[PDB]
C-alpha cells in the first residue's frame, strides 16, 4: 500500500529537479520564504537545534569541534546566522538558488564576514572537501533529493567530516510512506525510509529527536545526529 521509495513517486527525475529550481527561484528571499509561511516558528526551531547540537559539544573523547560547519540548502542563511556562526569559527553555505546566497550577504551582516565559501550548486552535484567540517547541517532540503542522490550525498558528507564530526538532518517526516508534493517538487518520507537511507550511506544514528511546540497542522519534524 504505502510507497517506500522515490522511484515509486517521481515520474521524471529531470523534471523533479527542474521544477524545484523554478519553485525556489520565485520564493522571496526572506525567513518566511525559507519557512513556507511559517517564519514565526524560526525561534522555536533554532532554540531546539541549539540544545540538540550542544549535546555533541561537551568535553570528552568524542567532542565535536568548532572550527567549521557546512549549512546545506542554507537559503538566505537563517540557520547560519542564528545557530552556526555563533558556535563555529567559519561556516560554508551551499544552496541551489543564487538569489538566496546573494541575499545572505545582506541578511548575515557583519558576522557574515566569517562565511567562507558560498557554493551555488545542487546537493546532488556537490562534493564537499574531505576532512573539512565538524558539523554538516542539512535542514528542510532532503525531500528535494531522490533516494539514490540522498544516499550518495550522505556518503560524500561522511567523507568531508573532521575527526569527531557529525551530520545533522532536520526535516519533515511522513507518518507513513513517501509522499510527493508536486507544487514545490519534493517528497516527505517516513522515519523508516529515512533510517534506511542513512544506513545505506554507511552512517549510524547518535541521536533522534522530535521537534516540539510546532503547529498541529504541519508534518512532524525530526532531528538526527549521524556519524
Amino acid at each position: 500500500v504505502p510507497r517506500g521509495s522515490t522511484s515509486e513517486v517521481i515520474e521524471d527525475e529531470k523534471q523533479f529537479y527542474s521544477k524545484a529550481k523554478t519553485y525556489w527561484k520565485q520564493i522571496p528571499p526572506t525567513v518566511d520564504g525559507m519557512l513556507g509561511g511559517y517564519g514565526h516558528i524560526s525561534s522555536i526551531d533554532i532554540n531546539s537545534s541549539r540544545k540538540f547540537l550542544q549535546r555533541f559539544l561537551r568535553e570528552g573523547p568524542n567532542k565535536t569541534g568548532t572550527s567549521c560547519a557546512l549549512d546545506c540548502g542554507a537559503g538566505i542563511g537563517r540557520i547560519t546566522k542564528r545557530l552556526l556562526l555563533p558556535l563555529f569559527r567559519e561556516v560554508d553555505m551551499v544552496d541551489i538558488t543564487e538569489d538566496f546566497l546573494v541575499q545572505a550577504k545582506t541578511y548575515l551582516g557583519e558576522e557574515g564576514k566569517r562565511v567562507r565559501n558560498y557554493f551555488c550548486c545542487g546537493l546532488q552535484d556537490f562534493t564537499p572537501e574531505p576532512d573539512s567540517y565538524d558539523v554538516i547541517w542539512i535542514q528542510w532540503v532532503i525531500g528535494h533529493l531522490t533516494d539514490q542522490h540522498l544516499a550518495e550525498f550522505l556518503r560524500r558528507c561522511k567523507g568531508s567530516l573532521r575527526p569527531n564530526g557529525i551530520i545533522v538532518i532536520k526535516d519533515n517526516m511522513a507518518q507513513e510512506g513517501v509522499i510527493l508534493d508536486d507544487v514545490d517538487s519534493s517528497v516527505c518520507r517516513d522515519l523508516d525510509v529515512v533510517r534506511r537511507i542513512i544506513c545505506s550511506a554507511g552512517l549510524s544514528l547518535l541521536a533522534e529527536e522530535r521537534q516540539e511546540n510546532l503547529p498541529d497542522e504541519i508534518y512532524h519534524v525530526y532531528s538526527f545526529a549521524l556519524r
Binding site: 525559507m34 513556507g36 511559517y38 516558528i41 508534493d181 504541519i218
Partner: peptide, 6 residues
C-alpha cells in the same frame, strides 16, 4: 519548508 499535512 515546514508545511501543512496534505
Amino acid at each position: 519548508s515546514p508545511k501543512r499535512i496534505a
